[PDB]
Design an enzyme around this catalytic site. Structure first.
Site, short mmCIF file in Angstrom:
data_model
loop_
_atom_site.label_atom_id
_atom_site.label_comp_id
_atom_site.label_asym_id
_atom_site.label_seq_id
_atom_site.Cartn_x
_atom_site.Cartn_y
_atom_site.Cartn_z
N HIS A 1 0.79 -1.21 0.00
CA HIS A 1 0.00 0.00 0.00
C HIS A 1 0.85 1.30 0.00
CE1 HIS A 1 -2.68 3.16 1.08
NE2 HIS A 1 -2.21 3.22 2.31
N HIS B 1 1.08 4.53 0.98
CA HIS B 1 0.38 5.19 2.07
C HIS B 1 0.21 6.70 1.90
CE1 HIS B 1 -0.68 5.46 6.48
NE2 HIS B 1 -0.53 6.71 6.11
N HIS C 1 4.22 0.13 2.17
CA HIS C 1 4.31 -1.04 3.03
C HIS C 1 3.30 -2.13 2.69
CE1 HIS C 1 0.71 -0.16 5.40
NE2 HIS C 1 1.09 1.11 5.41
N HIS D 1 0.38 -4.55 3.01
CA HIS D 1 -0.93 -4.46 3.65
C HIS D 1 -1.54 -5.85 3.65
CE1 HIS D 1 -4.26 -2.24 5.41
NE2 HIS D 1 -3.61 -1.11 5.21
N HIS E 1 -4.72 4.78 19.92
CA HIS E 1 -4.76 4.15 18.61
C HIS E 1 -4.67 5.21 17.51
CE1 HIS E 1 -7.21 1.55 21.40
NE2 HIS E 1 -6.15 0.80 21.14
N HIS F 1 -6.36 5.76 10.82
CA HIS F 1 -5.93 6.17 9.51
C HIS F 1 -6.99 5.82 8.46
CE1 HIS F 1 -3.82 6.19 5.76
NE2 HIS F 1 -3.77 4.87 5.73
N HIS G 1 -7.65 5.62 4.18
CA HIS G 1 -7.15 5.59 2.80
C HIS G 1 -7.91 6.52 1.86
CE1 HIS G 1 -5.01 1.51 3.20
NE2 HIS G 1 -5.42 1.87 4.41
N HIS H 1 -8.86 2.26 9.77
CA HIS H 1 -8.42 1.34 10.82
C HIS H 1 -7.28 1.89 11.66
CE1 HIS H 1 -4.55 0.41 8.89
NE2 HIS H 1 -5.21 0.48 7.75
N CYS H 2 -7.05 1.25 12.81
CA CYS H 2 -5.90 1.54 13.65
C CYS H 2 -4.66 1.12 12.87
CB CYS H 2 -5.99 0.76 14.97
SG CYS H 2 -4.58 0.97 16.11
N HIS H 3 -3.61 1.94 12.90
CA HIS H 3 -2.43 1.61 12.13
C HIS H 3 -1.43 0.83 12.94
CE1 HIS H 3 0.39 1.76 8.84
NE2 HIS H 3 -0.48 2.45 8.12
N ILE H 4 -1.75 0.59 14.21
CA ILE H 4 -0.99 -0.37 14.98
C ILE H 4 -1.31 -1.74 14.35
CG2 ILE H 4 -0.58 -1.38 17.24
CD1 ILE H 4 -1.29 1.22 18.56
N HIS I 1 -3.20 -4.55 15.78
CA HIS I 1 -4.58 -4.27 16.15
C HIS I 1 -5.52 -4.44 14.95
CE1 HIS I 1 -3.38 -1.66 19.88
NE2 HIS I 1 -2.84 -2.86 19.88
N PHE J 1 -9.52 -4.33 14.30
CA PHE J 1 -9.78 -2.89 14.49
C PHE J 1 -9.93 -2.12 13.18
CE2 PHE J 1 -8.72 0.22 18.20
CZ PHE J 1 -10.08 0.56 18.27
CU LIG Z 1 -4.67 0.33 18.00
CU LIG Z 2 -0.07 2.89 6.00
CU LIG Z 3 -2.96 4.53 3.76
CU LIG Z 4 -4.36 0.75 5.82
#
Ligand SMILES: [Cu+2]
Ligand SMILES: [Cu+2]
Ligand SMILES: [Cu+2]
Ligand SMILES: [Cu+2]
Length: 496
Positions: free
Chosen positions: A64, A66, A109, A111, A394, A397, A399, A449-452, A455, A460
């Site tokens: 992805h 980002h 990165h 995904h 958290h 993020h 897209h 979603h959470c980018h951790i 998670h 998440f």
């Molecule tokens: Cu999180």
């Molecule tokens: Cu990302």
């Molecule tokens: Cu993104």
């Molecule tokens: Cu994402």
């Protein structure tokens, strides 16, 4: 470096960014992942050739880009089972898109599952020939990109489900508590010169509080958004955020610690963990001896503002939008839940479902995870922090978009007038209610979603299916993309 047209050969090998050897993911035969660049308006053709053979870290991949809008090119977004099926090993896949209207600091990165923690993550800079802050610095290039990243001695699916870092890597390097003699990243500057440093969290989990001994920073860019210059003396950057800051090499020729303190793990600088060297050209090849000092001017997000001072989409008052969505965080059964649902990858990707037939969110999997959006409307999302869901803050993020943080964490004010824009925001600690607005301008399925990463793996996440009736129309798909699914389906468990 490489880009905007480039093959990216993905494979496995051994690495040791912290003096500890382990198998990881290599991009073009290198760890960390190489820098991609280009200019505003450039066609990005990134041909990802998948040669991975290791099964623990997954033979399949997808990538992805980002923070890229990908209008028209939703099929190229990256998230597996939302926008495409994963690229299968021994195949190739071409990501063909344009950056017509964007400029700033980005990153790429995997995904697919928790795969980016294992090494498939690098920076992308899209330089702007007519950058507004162009005159605040003498230097902006390969040597001014600085990545932060958590490094795990135990691979993503080997160690715990939500594990803790052994080390912070700065520009690929750094120390753990058993390797206090590993090499430290060195960033060189020339006395007298000014640097546009580009900060990129490549983190999977930890947030970092970034600072430099004896140096103040002028932040001029958050994620990919031009900001009004703001001088801070430390910057808390959450997973997947970017900050661009100018540094003025006006101090004494010496060595200064670059500090990156994480909120979990080894939470100090003993032995020079979480550290790097800022080396003035001409100073000794040795560890700095500088002492840290408390940050009196910390970066405060609510206080940032876009350069153009632009207002949020919508009317300056709550629910002053065409649709408002609250996201109620939760967590039971090891799974995170937003509004009672817990996102698990659908067997048909969210994008194929729309192109095959599905007309509404109720006609889309996984059910309870997909919110339909209308077109050319002002959306407002709210993300109230809760203890209910562990591991905060958290960093959420979205897209396909940039959004206005009307309300940041740690604040109660609502900024409808000149809010900071970005693409990754912290939702904060229990009590905060971070709120974001944007306009729909991009027909397609977008992840939120959470980018951790650990998670998102435990659910998440939700999907925005924005402007469905026009998704098929504005996102023509390449043969190769249509062939992704048939290929990945004819794959056994371990060849995945
Ligand atoms: Cu999180
Ligand atoms: Cu990302
Ligand atoms: Cu993104
Ligand atoms: Cu994402």
């Amino acid at each position: 470096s490489i880009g905007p047209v480039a093959d990216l050969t993905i494979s496995n090998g051994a690495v040791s960014p912290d003096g500890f050897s382990r198998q990881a993911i290599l991009v073009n035969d290198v760890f960390p992942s190489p820098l991609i660049t280009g200019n505003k308006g450039d066609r990005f053709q990134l041909n990802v050739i998948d040669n991975m053979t290791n099964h623990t870290m997954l033979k399949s991949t997808s990538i992805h880009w980002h923070g890229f809008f990908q209008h028209g090119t939703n099929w190229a977004d990256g998230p597996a089972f939302v926008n495409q099926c994963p690229i299968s090993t021994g195949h190739a896949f071409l990501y063909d898109f344009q950056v017509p209207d964007q400029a700033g600091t980005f990153w790429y990165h995997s995904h697919l599952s928790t795969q980016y923690c294992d090494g498939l993550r690098g920076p992308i800079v899209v330089y702007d020939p007519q950058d507004p802050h162009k005159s605040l610095y003498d230097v902006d290039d390969d040597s001014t990109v600085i990545t932060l990243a958590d490094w795990y001695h135990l691979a993503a699916k080997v160690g715990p489900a939500v594990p803790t870092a052994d080390a912070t890597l700065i520009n690929g390097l750094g120390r753990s508590i058993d390797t206090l003699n590993a090499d430290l990243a060195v960033i060189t500057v020339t006395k007298g010169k000014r640097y546009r440093f580009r900060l990129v969290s490549l983190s999977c989990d930890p947030n970092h509080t970034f600072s430099i001994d004896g140096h103040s920073l002028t932040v001029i860019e958050a994620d990919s958004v031009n900001l009004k210059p703001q001088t801070v003396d430390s910057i808390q950057i959450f997973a997947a955020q970017r900050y661009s800051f100018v540094l003025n090499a006006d101090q004494d020729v010496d060595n200064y610690w670059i500090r990156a303190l994480p909120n979990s793990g080894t939470r100090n600088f003993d032995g020079g963990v979480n550290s790097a060297i800022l080396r003035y050209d001409g100073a000794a090849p040795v560890e700095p001896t500088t002492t840290q000092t408390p940050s009196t001017q910390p970066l405060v997000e609510s206080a940032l503002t876009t350069l153009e001072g632009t207002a949020a989409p919508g009317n300056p008052t709550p629910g002053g939008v065409d649709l408002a969505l609250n996201m109620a965080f939760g967590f039971a059964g090891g799974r995170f839940t937003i509004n009672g649902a817990s996102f698990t990858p659908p067997t048909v990707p969210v994008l194929l479902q729309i192109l095959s037939g599905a007309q509404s969110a109720q006609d889309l999997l996984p059910s309870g995870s997909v919110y339909s959006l209308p077109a050319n409307a002002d959306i407002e999302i709210s993300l109230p922090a809760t203890s209910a869901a562990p591991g905060f803050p958290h960093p959420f993020h979205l897209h396909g978009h940039t959004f206005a943080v009307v309300r940041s964490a740690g604040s109660s004010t609502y900024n409808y007038a000149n809010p900071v824009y970005r693409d990754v925001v912290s939702t904060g600690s229990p009590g905060d209610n971070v709120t974001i607005r944007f306009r729909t301008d991009n027909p397609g399925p977008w992840f939120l979603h959470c980018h951790i990463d650990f998670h998102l793996e435990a659910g998440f996440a939700v999907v925005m299916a924005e402007d469905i009736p026009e998704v098929a129309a504005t996102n023509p798909v390449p043969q190769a993309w249509s062939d992704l699914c048939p290929t990945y389906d004819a794959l056994s468990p371990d060849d995945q």
